[PDB]
Amino acid sequence: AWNSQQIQFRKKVIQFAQQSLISDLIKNDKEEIFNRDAWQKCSEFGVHGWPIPARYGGQELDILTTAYALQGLGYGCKDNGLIFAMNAHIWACEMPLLTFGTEEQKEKYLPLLCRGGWIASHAATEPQAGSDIYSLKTTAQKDGDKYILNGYKHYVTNGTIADLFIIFATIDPSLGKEGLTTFMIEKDTPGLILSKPISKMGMRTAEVPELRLENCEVSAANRLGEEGTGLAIFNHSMEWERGFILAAAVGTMERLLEQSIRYARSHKQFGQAIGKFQLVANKLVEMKLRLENAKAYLYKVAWMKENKQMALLEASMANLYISEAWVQSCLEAIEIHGAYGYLTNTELERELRDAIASKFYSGTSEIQRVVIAKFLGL
Amino acid sequence: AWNSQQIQFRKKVIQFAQQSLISDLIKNDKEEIFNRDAWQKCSEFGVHGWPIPARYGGQELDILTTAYALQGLGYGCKDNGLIFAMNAHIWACEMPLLTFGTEEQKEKYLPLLCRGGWIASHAATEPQAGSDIYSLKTTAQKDGDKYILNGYKHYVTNGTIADLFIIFATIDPSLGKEGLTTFMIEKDTPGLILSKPISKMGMRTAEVPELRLENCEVSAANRLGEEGTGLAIFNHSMEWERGFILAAAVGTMERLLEQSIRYARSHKQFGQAIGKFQLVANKLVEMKLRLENAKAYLYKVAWMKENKQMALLEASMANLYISEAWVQSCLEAIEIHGAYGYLTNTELERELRDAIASKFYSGTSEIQRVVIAKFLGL
Amino acid sequence: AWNSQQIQFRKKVIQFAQQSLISDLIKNDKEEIFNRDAWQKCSEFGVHGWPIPARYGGQELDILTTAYALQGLGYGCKDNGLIFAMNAHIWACEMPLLTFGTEEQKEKYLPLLCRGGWIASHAATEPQAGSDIYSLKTTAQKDGDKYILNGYKHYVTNGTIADLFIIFATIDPSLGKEGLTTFMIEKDTPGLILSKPISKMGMRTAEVPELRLENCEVSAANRLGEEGTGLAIFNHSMEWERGFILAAAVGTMERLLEQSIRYARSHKQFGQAIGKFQLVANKLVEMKLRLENAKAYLYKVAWMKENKQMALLEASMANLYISEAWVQSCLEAIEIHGAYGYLTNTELERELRDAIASKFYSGTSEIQRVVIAKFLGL
Amino acid sequence: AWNSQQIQFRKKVIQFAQQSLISDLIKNDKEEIFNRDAWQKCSEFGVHGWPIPARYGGQELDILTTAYALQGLGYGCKDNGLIFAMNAHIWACEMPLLTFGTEEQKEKYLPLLCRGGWIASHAATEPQAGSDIYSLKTTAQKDGDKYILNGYKHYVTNGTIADLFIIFATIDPSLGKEGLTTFMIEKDTPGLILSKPISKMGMRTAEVPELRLENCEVSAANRLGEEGTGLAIFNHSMEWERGFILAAAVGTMERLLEQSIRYARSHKQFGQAIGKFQLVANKLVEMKLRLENAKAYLYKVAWMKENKQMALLEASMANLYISEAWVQSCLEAIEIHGAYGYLTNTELERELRDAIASKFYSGTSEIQRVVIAKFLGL
Ligand SMILES: Cc1cc2nc3c(=O)[nH]c(=O)nc-3n(C[C@H](O)[C@H](O)[C@H](O)COP(=O)(O)OP(=O)(O)OC[C@H]3O[C@@H](n4cnc5c(N)ncnc54)[C@H](O)[C@@H]3O)c2cc1C
Ligand SMILES: Cc1cc2nc3c(=O)[nH]c(=O)nc-3n(C[C@H](O)[C@H](O)[C@H](O)COP(=O)(O)OP(=O)(O)OC[C@H]3O[C@@H](n4cnc5c(N)ncnc54)[C@H](O)[C@@H]3O)c2cc1C
Ligand SMILES: Cc1cc2nc3c(=O)[nH]c(=O)nc-3n(C[C@H](O)[C@H](O)[C@H](O)COP(=O)(O)OP(=O)(O)OC[C@H]3O[C@@H](n4cnc5c(N)ncnc54)[C@H](O)[C@@H]3O)c2cc1C
Ligand SMILES: Cc1cc2nc3c(=O)[nH]c(=O)nc-3n(C[C@H](O)[C@H](O)[C@H](O)COP(=O)(O)OP(=O)(O)OC[C@H]3O[C@@H](n4cnc5c(N)ncnc54)[C@H](O)[C@@H]3O)c2cc1C
């Protein structure tokens, strides 16, 4: 059901990613190197501005085209960490700003994230507030026209390279859910303390440090939405995050399937291609079923959000399905290749290491299941 | 993405099935009773004529509407055996006749199946030719204007009540695939021998006897397609069968999900509803994920066939997914209800017994996997 | 690790079951007929007396030999309902009586259950006390030397044919878990009301009616253990039940594996035996792995109980594993046979229907998981 | 069923591993450092000599004690790569030498491997002969009292540090299976070329380079067994390898279970410990079931090999079960910990990376399934 414009644009995205995004991935993964050159090239192409209206220097593309192009990006670009870093910037930072920001807030910050080279971070999670986000301890005390922010935020994607921080704090912890408020703090604000990026299994080309706020002053002008709107901002941010952060992962799944079919047809054992044995062929049949199901979950959310509908249930189902489908297909691709798929220089192992992250960011598999159960009535 | 006409027609199908299809299903399943009254009422409604053009007395509905209305029928009608019996008549008999039949063959036989109360059977499988259907032994020898048919066909859905038989035979077994030819034989033709309907686990309200042909004479005018076209006719009829026979099963899955949510909310243990325990709620979360995936496989095939595309791969993926998804969801519905779900009077047990059949008719799960692997290039 | 005596005795059990237990199983399952003739022959052989001391007319066999012989019984006897009915009588009735009964209680009832043709029932479960068994509503009011019992017990295996009833009641519901008490009530005691046996999916050759107590008088002499000991009696009964009710199911699993290997080697398709296709062969590989794991869980509990140890965790792990392993292997046996495995006259379908019951009696799969989690410290 | 001396010896093994095997595992894994100091300490303790008779400087333990002590080593030692490197040396090199070697071959080489600090490698696999091991191309041409070896062996565990090489070659490729012969070649023999150790996902503390033989001369005295015995030697080598290489992995599984229980009880969310949520507690119930099953498969093989029985089927079942059980339990341990389990410094991520290797060494999961199917008669 994709038109000529959509086929050609995705084909243009794949070609761009295959030609002008080449990196020494074995080295960048091992050494934990974020590709700033590739981020800059993607922004020049328009990746960041894809769901953003043209009045804020965006590309003003429809959601279905944005999701289709992202899938193309995932297929063409092997750097999964870069893809994750950009999606965090787009869906968890640019989107809530576009929806809840005032005309002056949007006119100042959106063109910068869009075209300017400014990077954004979403800092909401805390050591005792991961799954239980509502139980945030980061307080924001009003002092006339300003706010004094104090707290600790662990896991802040892009933190060490971010120019603007989207922070979820509370005006009063007694209020609970009703006390949650969002603040936009620029990089190098006195009181904003960052750690060195934390070492992890995969997504090593994406910088994830810790953040600490020690009497961090912010004007009431940089507060996103009214006092107490923080919950509505977070729930809206998760809708875009859960449903779209894994759009490119579907593309990666398509690349691994074609690579595995090629190997199952090429590699021979017992006088025949490995794919001639049903135990090998079935792994590719399972990879195919998962890929088509992932596309279905992605395109339903994309359609719903384009038709201005509330799709938290659909985004949760998409994130739960695609994250697990991705890990499983990666595991099977390594199996098809045998011992060869376990070697560093093959690069299939990195794919699995990166895939696991998706089971933790945007919420755990168990959280999505709890969210789905609530929507069923339970 | 369904229009007002589609929502209203499916709602009309559910209401019709809930009001005018009421049967003593515990009794009819136990005693193996085929509901002729309900078959007649469905034909009066237009079920049989749904994919048939209005010129042959059909409804001339588009495939996507036909599939949506079928999902509605499955939700509203509890008689899974009747649903299977009708889908076998529509997709494996009416469809190949509409596609490969001459104007005179269609004008004679199609209006009868639509509105005449004529029932059709598809007899292709044999004791030594189930999965290996190309290895058919049923021979057809030409004698001027006629053909003398000899063979044995096991598993003939609707056989004991059919008025017209769609038979897959061979002109010369040496030719193999190129020798396969189809014949339309009317009920009670000298040489057409039927057994008593065979007793099975589920689908007990659908008559499945054995067939024997002892020098069965048939005119060359009643031969569907040219000599050797039988393979093309079978492959076409599988495409429609695999993709659409389980359209109603998706509806049944929707009914059991809502029935299980109601029970998980109603039934209490340890001072709370069972659905408050995550091990119970997760079974409903799995039922929800499977239901949405089943809809996706069904609607892709429906779209493709409507847009006149060859969808054997998509029909095989749909039949493989939906048949297993149904059995699994049926098993979980019994689990949610506990020992209560194991009792005859609850009716959830019959649902599982009926669901298993889907793993054997239209081809086994293993056959679909082999078919998918071939389409992948293995 | 089995000696000559153990090999020969099991071989003697198989031969006995294969020669003198022959029944019209298709008919008895369809018509719901309990085989009293086979129950009598098993008692004459000594089955019921296997874990019982010779002084109470038992066989005085060690647990490991008892479990090995019961596996042999499961392999040789096709009537799964009879096997379930006998195991309920042995483990849930004879065992708590042997452990908690006084000399006079043992001397009177045990020889009768062993060789007297007396059948016993275990009535503990209630409509609002299934999984939450401690929340029993059946009250027992003391009136000098007697007790007045009032309540309702659903699912009472052997109820319609039992001579002695093992009833779990409460002296005071305010005490809860500390108020539980066990009573032995003889058949046809004024106030003991039984329903017709309830119709179910499988285990149709085992009678499971409902029980109602309306001012049922019982002597303090027929009270098993002291007041408040009911919990200890139930927990002890569950150890023997969970760990040994499925000992014969392991034997049934061995029979279906060899039956399926024979079919996979005999039945041919595409010019070779079906077992030559890896998707068919893998089902038997899975059946083999499950059979060996089931033996391991069964023999661990048998050893522990033989060495007078508390094995509730091990019995729960055995019942959870074996019940699910049995259902899964039954489904695969039907799959290997194709449409043939779905027919009533084949008998593989009945196996699956019987196997499901194991997921509900002796506690549900979810309950076992909860029990295991508590033992782990969670 | 373990006695006081077996409990005490395993406890002594755990204490030794916990106190005198401490390494900078995050660094060694990242930098690919083999711990020679820990290998030396293990040999001083007697690890290598455990299944070796005291005559050849061994410890002469019974297999059941050896397996129990290896389980203890896996629990106490976190360096999975060292454990794999040692098990490769014991089971694939020392064991075939003990069984097939002459008195002079055993007297010279066994005391060295056992107590001399000599390391051994098993080189059988080739680029065109992995699963299809019979199709070896490495030729051995006789020249009176010597043999000229030519070929290429990929994946040679311990190759870069080995003093003795166990090589599988062919006297005549036309003979196939009947032409297979084993040779013992000492390190630095002209013609023995080794590559740099290959970089892989996990097991990074174990050196796995490639090997090339260019007119490598070896005496007929250093030929293990007679000409054509190579298959019997390999299949005997696979019995010990498959059944005992994963004995320590069972210990690792026990460590991760206790570590995960501690975290599920300690870590709190939504006002309670995470283990109070059934989706978390079930991962630990599954970890428990898998651990007990792994112990059962390990102890069956250990018993059979102690009682001098052919256990290739049992070793294949053990390898297939344990390797998959290990990967799954590692994945779940990371899930229980959330994002915390994905960090390098947590060390759970390395456990999973190491676990995957087990699905490729000693044969792939698919190969074991094929081996099991052959034993069943398919
Ligand atoms: C309720 C019901 C109604 C039916 N109605 C009709 C009807 O009206 N008309 C009609 O023509 N047919 C009908 N059939 C037949 C049906 O399509 C068969 O179940 C199907 O053709 C499979 O044949 P089989 O069961 O004989 O199994 P087999 O084909 O004998 O195969 C045996 C087993 O081996 C496996 N196997 C076989 N070949 C391969 C392979 N190449 N690769 C891997 N595994 C393989 C399969 O998984 C199967 O389990 C009906 C069947 C049922 C159950
Ligand atoms: C064939 C048969 C014979 C029987 N014979 C006897 C007999 O002789 N004597 C006797 O006393 N009983 C007998 N029973 C009763 C049997 O033990 C029950 O099936 C069992 O007690 C649980 O059944 P239930 O559905 O009433 O549980 P329910 O309490 O109805 O549970 C409903 C569902 O919720 C889930 N659930 C409930 N509580 C929890 C929890 N805490 N955590 C997680 N999930 C939970 C369960 O998974 C279950 O599926 C028999 C049952 C059967 C099927
Ligand atoms: C860490 C490590 C250390 C090793 N150390 C040694 C060592 O010291 N000495 C040594 O000799 N070897 C060693 N090996 C080699 C190891 O045993 C191989 O992984 C194994 O032999 C499988 O070969 P392969 O990976 O080449 O895959 P292949 O054999 O090429 O097969 C490719 C794929 O096809 C499938 N397949 C192949 N044949 C069949 C079939 N008949 N039926 C079904 N599916 C099939 C398999 O599942 C596999 O995934 C080591 C391997 C590893 C990973
Ligand atoms: C690569 C990466 C990048 C990230 N980037 C960001 C970022 O930029 N900004 C940001 O704000 N956050 C970020 N996060 C945090 C991320 O969203 C967390 O992984 C998520 O919040 C869960 O964190 P947790 O493991 O602390 O959860 P925990 O709350 O510690 O959960 C512990 C375990 O218990 C289970 N559990 C907990 N509660 C329940 C329940 N109610 N029901 C059932 N099971 C339950 C969960 O399954 C989990 O496995 C990032 C995480 C990762 C891994």
Automatic annotation (TrEMBL), chains A, B, C, D:
Enzyme class: oxidoreductase
Record's keyword terms, sorted: Branched-chain amino acid catabolism, FAD, Flavoprotein, Nucleotide-binding, Oxidoreductase
Domain Acyl-CoA oxidase/dehydrogenase middle, chain residue ranges per copy: 123-216
Pathway noted in the entry: Amino-acid degradation; L-valine degradation
Top-level lineage group: Bacteria
One Gene Ontology biological process: branched-chain amino acid catabolic process
InterPro entries the UniProt entry points to: Acyl-CoA_Oxase/DH_mid-dom, Acyl-CoA_Oxase/DH_mid-dom_sf, AcylCo_DH-like_C, AcylCo_DH/oxidase_C, AcylCoA_DH/ox_N, AcylCoA_DH/ox_N_sf, AcylCoA_DH/oxidase_NM_dom_sf
Binding-site list for FAD: 122, 124-125, 131, 157, 267, 278, 339, 360, 364, 366
Residue intervals of the Acyl-CoA dehydrogenase/oxidase C-terminal domain: 228-376
Flavoprotein as UniProt keyword: yes
GO molecular function: acyl-CoA dehydrogenase activity; flavin adenine dinucleotide binding
The name this protein goes by in its record: AnaB
The encoding gene: anaB
